[PDB]
Amino acid sequence: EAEQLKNQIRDARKACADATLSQITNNIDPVGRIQMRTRRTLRGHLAKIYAMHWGTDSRLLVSASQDGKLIIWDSYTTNKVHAIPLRSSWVMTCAYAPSGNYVACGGLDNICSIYNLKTREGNVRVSRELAGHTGYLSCCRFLDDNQIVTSSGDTTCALWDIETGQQTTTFTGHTGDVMSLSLAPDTRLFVSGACDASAKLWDVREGMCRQTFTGHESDINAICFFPNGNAFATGSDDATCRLFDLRADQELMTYSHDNIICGITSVSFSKSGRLLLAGYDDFNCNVWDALKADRAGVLAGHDNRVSCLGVTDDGMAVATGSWDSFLKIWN
């Protein structure tokens, strides 16, 4: 029954495929070597950093480490504006609210803690404690001050509602753990990558999957969304990055090298979307020409594996947090 539908989908994808992006990208000159330099080193985490996020203002950034600390850095001055102590030391994700008032963090507690920063008391406290996931919570992303999408290790995602404090919709269909997700620029749909080597696109409003992409061979540790929202990129344990498009329904590009045999940990795009910066278990991050799949630089400089990466919304800098816990900012 399902094999017929799978065959139909594959045949439709092949019919829609005429020429690969590599084939038609020969007419564009390459970006060339990029000598990105460390402009800041935001040391201060006691243990390995596992996630970080930029504020919409592109100045503040929240970073979570396994020592139970969630530090909000002012990237320009390197000062720490808050150091939230978590109730559970094993935090695996963090998120900065688009308005900059709240900060979410998940982890092995299976619970998403939402802290309020702009609080009249002057001290940050757990504004909300969203529970309902039956597994470790592996990604958080705010849609506004009253919504947050959390993807957990129980093979599900969930759109919550902070004001009322319980699930508003549940996104199911993944076979394995849902490692990471990325919201579209319009926050009308989002793609989540799981360990079943498949990334699924969900409509936040409809609460149902729209299309799945299964071009990977192993777990999908990282996933982003091309700046225009019409395509996304994923990184898997097989050391390969894959750029899929929503409309083409299929993989557009594969970024890989013969000298990398270690999985991805974090991917992101530049403001224009021309560059794809991917963090690797090889203690370094690589910049890829999103249109030509060429290693246009390498951001080495971490004594341990890069666990999180993120470009500022204005595109000025690229923060990179690694298990060495120094969180270098590149530009």
């Binding site: 390995k48 001055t77 000062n79 030391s89 299976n110 597994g135």
Partner: protein
């Protein structure tokens, strides 16, 4: 000459206060020893966790127990799904993995030797010692003593097995039991010895349903586990 300078001074004051707090917390973090409590549900992991609880709400059940002026932080991860290859990466910095395995139920044992094999050879745990608790020995002793303990069928090699010379059995236990309980211990040790370049070790311990010495055993092993770490750091290796 005051609009931007008061804010800068306030930001620096907050930064220095936060840095002082982080320095204060660093001593506690370095002093506390983090542990991971793995083992099947049929094993007595929860009972041991409570037994040191006397001396987490959802997902991961932390446990503060303190012995000899040093505090141990155990993390029973029983709230997660059956599969663990992903969140195991979180505990790459744990001092020692505590592995509680039910020595009584044999049918559910050859899987505990295989959860141990994957753990021992795991990519992110090839530098973490495993404190192995062969729990529920009283049940095993009364089960073998009462017969119907056809452990030979599950492991045919048990027929061609004899108690090792270096064993230290209690004076008043059935010699058959001593050969049965040391047989299981060796199987886990064979898995541990078959891999690892002397970078992490296995500490097999026999525990009953109730034993106040479990915290002491973990303290002794953690003492020896960091002793090896200190020797490596001091270039004695």
């Amino acid at each position: 000459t005051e609009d931007q300078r008061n804010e800068e001074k306030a930001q620096r004051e907050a930064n220095k206060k936060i840095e002082k707090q982080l320095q204060k917390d660093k001593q506690v973090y370095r002093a506390t020893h983090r542990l991971l409590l793995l083992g099947a549900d049929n094993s007595g992991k929860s009972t041991i966790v409570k037994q040191m609880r006397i001396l987490g709400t959802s997902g991961i059940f932390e446990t503060k127990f303190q012995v000899d002026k040093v505090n141990f932080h155990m993390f029973d991860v029983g709230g997660q799904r059956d599969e663990r290859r992903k969140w195991i990466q979180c505990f790459n910095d744990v001092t020692a993995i505590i592995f509680v395995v039910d020595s009584s139920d044999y049918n559910r044992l050859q899987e505990a030797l295989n959860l141990f094999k994957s753990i021992w050879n795991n990519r992110w745990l090839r530098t973490i010692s495993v404190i192995l608790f062969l729990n529920k020995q009283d049940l095993l002793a009364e089960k073998v003593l009462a017969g119907k303990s056809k452990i030979e069928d599950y492991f045919p090699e048990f027929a061609r097995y004899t108690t090792p010379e270096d064993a230290t059995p209690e004076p008043g236990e059935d010699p058959r039991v001593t050969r049965a309980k040391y047989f299981i211990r060796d199987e886990f040790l064979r898995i541990s010895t078959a891999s690892g370049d002397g970078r992490h070790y296995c500490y097999p311990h026999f525990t009953c349903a109730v034993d106040t010495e479990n915290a002491r055993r973990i303290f002794n092993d953690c003492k020896d586990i960091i002793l090896q770490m200190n020797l490596r750091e001091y270039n004695l290796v």
